[PDB]
Amino acid sequence: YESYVRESQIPSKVKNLRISIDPKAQTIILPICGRPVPFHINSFKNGSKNEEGDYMYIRLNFNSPGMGSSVKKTELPYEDGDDKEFVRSLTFRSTNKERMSEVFKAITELKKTAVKRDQERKTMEDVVAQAQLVEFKGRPKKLEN
Amino acid sequence: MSTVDFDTIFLNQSKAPGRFRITSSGLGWKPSSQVPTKGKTDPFLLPSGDILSVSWSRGYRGWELRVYTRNDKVIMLDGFEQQDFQQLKNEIQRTFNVNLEHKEHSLRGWNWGKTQLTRAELVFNVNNRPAWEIPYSEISNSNLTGRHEISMELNPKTVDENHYETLGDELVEVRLYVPGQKSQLFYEQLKDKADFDTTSEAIVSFEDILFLTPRGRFEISMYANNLRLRGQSYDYKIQNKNVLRIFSLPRLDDRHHLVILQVDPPLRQGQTRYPFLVMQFDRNEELEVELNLSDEEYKSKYEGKLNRSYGTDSTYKILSHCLRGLTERRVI
Q1: Contact A9 B107 (CB under 8 A)
Q2: Sign of the alpha-carbon dihedral angle for B94, B95, B97, B102
Q3: Is the bond leading into B214 cis (omega within 30 degrees of zero)?
């Protein structure tokens, strides 16, 4: 999967040095030291929100090997690699509690929509493309109720 | 002497825009006088002799000029337009004899890659491209959290007499997972680079406690005013005032012991709630625990309420005594 191919694809709304979510590209742009780093909802695992004082500390966890997601070995959300290092979690803080709560809700909703679409695909995947039913040109035999 | 100047440039993620200037003596940045920034109005000045290398890359506010200094500091200047690149390249080359490098960043959205400890910054590479970099000066502390897990705490930028107000959401903590038998060597190099000093928090912690309600395993971290339950999927913060009652009840199986907390308001997971937290201990489970308290704070606040050290006694007894001492609730 991919979040963006060109820097132009990144929305102009990103200009705020804050967490910006792109539902169309299923991407969570995170402000890491003035860097607009995109994180695809597929790489994202689960999130935990904790309002500590005036700052809302939200820890966004990501898929990491070792008893991680419930997904079977057949499909892995990352490429196999013993030498690959992973971003396991990022914790952000903000003075604005309401917006930060809305951002967390929107990340959680985006994940639910992604999982639902992947289940719907799988319920249609192994299903072999069947031929089209040919209607009977006369009065068909029927069983009612 | 052609002084080249750029308006609307921001220094190190400053909230206020400033005027950036290139001179034969070095780089200068001054905040624009239109914002009442409780704060020194003094121009930032970087001498020409301190400039090592300069990179150009995409930032939040347009393009970012990242200046590497000989003193292992990174200076970030953001707010440039794409057209400014040709002018900046010619002026930096002419004035400092330094090449302006164009650095393309990974936009794939992958959380896997390779970390690379560069002289002044920690770089995370995704498919041979930098995804993000963290200057060592922004790292406050680093701590091995498991056999393959490295947690870096970042200096929370609040109010310092020498720093411009930052604008946005701030990164506080980064956790990396480094597989292979490798994370200890990675940690040692990073720790030695900036002499990171380990710290200890939480009066007392209890790891791997089995809850029957909510069903799951939780770490219990106790503080002076609050109790934290840390769970793989759910973190809870309970104030000590919200604990109404503590029950310590033996199970009839004569093998497990129940500790039960009544909490008001009841904990929430969505629709139905948890007015009672039910913990399950083995009766043969023994734990030794020293309280993380100074001798002055222990004597003044906790003397006769808590023991300074608990010997190797049953975990549920130590936990019930700690809960009694911190919540001031009677154990039933």
Answers
A1: yes
A2: negative
A3: yes
Of B114, B138, B177, the CB nearest to A88: B177
β-bridge partners, B9? B18
- Which ranges constitute the DSSP H helices of chain B? 84-96, 183-194, 295-297, 315-327
Contacts of A127 (CB under 8 A, 6+ apart): none
B268 touching A, CB under 8 A? no
Q: Which of A52, A69, A33 is nearest to B223 (CA)?
A: A52
Residue type, B309: S
- Expressed in percent and rounded to 5, the helix, strand and coil fractions of chain A are 20, 25, 50
**Closest-CA residue in chain A for B78?**
A34
Per-residue DSSP letters for B139-207? EEEEEEEETTEEEEEE------TT-PPB-S-EEEEEEEE-----HHHHHHHHHHHHT------SSEEEE
The tally of CA atoms less than 13 A away on the side-chain side of residue B185 is 7
Q: How far apart are CA A48 and CA B269, in angstroms?
A: 12
Q: A51 and A63 in contact (C-beta within 8 Å)? A: no
Distance CA B118, CA B52 (A): 14
Residue B126 structure tokens: 């995704």
B8, B105, B110, B134: best to mutate for the A interface, most A CBs within 10 A: B110
- Calpha distance B322→B221 (Å, rounded): 11
Please list the residues that pair with B290 across neighbouring strands.
B309
Maximal C-alpha separation, chain A: 76
Backbone angles phi, psi at B306, to 5 degrees: -130, 150
Q: Locate the chain B residue with the closest alpha carbon to A45.
A: B233
Strand order across the B51-58 sheet: B44-47, B26-31, B18-23, B4-11, B74-80, B63-69, B51-58, B100-102
Contact B109, A27 (CB under 8 A): yes
State how far the Cα of A41 lies from the Cα of A142, in Å rounded to an integer. 48
Cβ atoms of A28 and A107 closer than 8 Å: yes
The DSSP letter of residue B300 is: I
Q: CA-nearest residue of chain A to B107?
A: A4
Nearest CA to CA, how far is A97 from chain B (Å)?
11
CA distance B231 to B32: 47
From which experimental method does this structure derive? cryo-EM
Phi, psi for residue A14 in degrees, rounded to 5: -55, -30
Helix, strand, or coil (residue B104): coil
